[PDB]
Structures are given as C-alpha cells and as structure tokens.
Amino acid sequence: MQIFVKTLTGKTITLEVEPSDTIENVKAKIQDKEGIPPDQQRLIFAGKQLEDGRTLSDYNIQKESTLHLVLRLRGG
C-alpha cells in the first residue's frame, strides 16, 4: 500500500506503508524518506496522537490515511 503525507514541499509526499506496519517503523519510514529525524517527524492519524507500539490494522487507513506532519517550536 501507499498513503499520502502533507509536509515540506513537492506536491505531497507519497509513502509506501502496508496495513500491518507499526507506528514506530512508520514514523521511521517517513522520517527516513523525508531526510529528517523523529525529533521533528510528528506522526498523527486523523487528529489522533499515536502510540508507536500500535499496529496499522487498528489505525486502519487507505488513501484517507494522509497522516500529515506538523512541526513548530521544537527544532531550533
């Protein structure tokens, strides 16, 4: 599967994750292809904070995922 992520610039970044991943590795997956650390990469899904040790089959998304990334105050 892939999902969107709104962040940075480049008409939304596309993000190859399956409906079985763990948010620990997804936060990784994104932060790694975004060339950024977890100390700024901030995983949300649908207005929910995530638990890292949680499976994608519970958080349950396809396309509508668009988990988006927010930073401010932290980082500098």
Curated annotation (Swiss-Prot):
Annotated positions of the Phosphoserine modification: 65
Function: Exists either covalently attached to another protein, or free (unanchored). When covalently bound, it is conjugated to target proteins via an isopeptide bond either as a monomer (monoubiquitin), a polymer linked via different Lys residues of the ubiquitin (polyubiquitin chains) or a linear polymer linked via the initiator Met of the ubiquitin (linear polyubiquitin chains).
PTM statement from Swiss-Prot or TrEMBL: Phosphorylated at Ser-65 by PINK1 during mitophagy. Phosphorylated ubiquitin specifically binds and activates parkin (PRKN), triggering mitophagy. Phosphorylation does not affect E1-mediated E2 charging of ubiquitin but affects discharging of E2 enzymes to form polyubiquitin chains. It also affects deubiquitination by deubiquitinase enzymes such as USP30.
Record-annotated site: Interacts with activating enzyme: 54, 72
Residues bearing PTM (Microbial infection) ADP-ribosylthreonine: 66
Site annotation Essential for function: residues: 68
Residues modified as ADP-ribosylglycine: 76
Domain Ubiquitin-like: 1-76
Crosslink position(s): Glycyl lysine isopeptide (Gly-Lys) (interchain with K-? in acceptor proteins): 76
Resulting phenotype, residue 76 to A: Loss of ADP-ribosylation
Covalent cross-link site, Glycyl lysine isopeptide (Lys-Gly) (interchain with G-Cter in ubiquitin): 6, 11, 27, 29, 33, 48, 63
Protein name stated in the entry: Ubiquitin
Effect after changing residue 74 to G: No effect on ADP-ribosylation
Residues included from the entire protein: 1 to 76 of 128
Localization per Swiss-Prot or TrEMBL: Cytoplasm; Nucleus
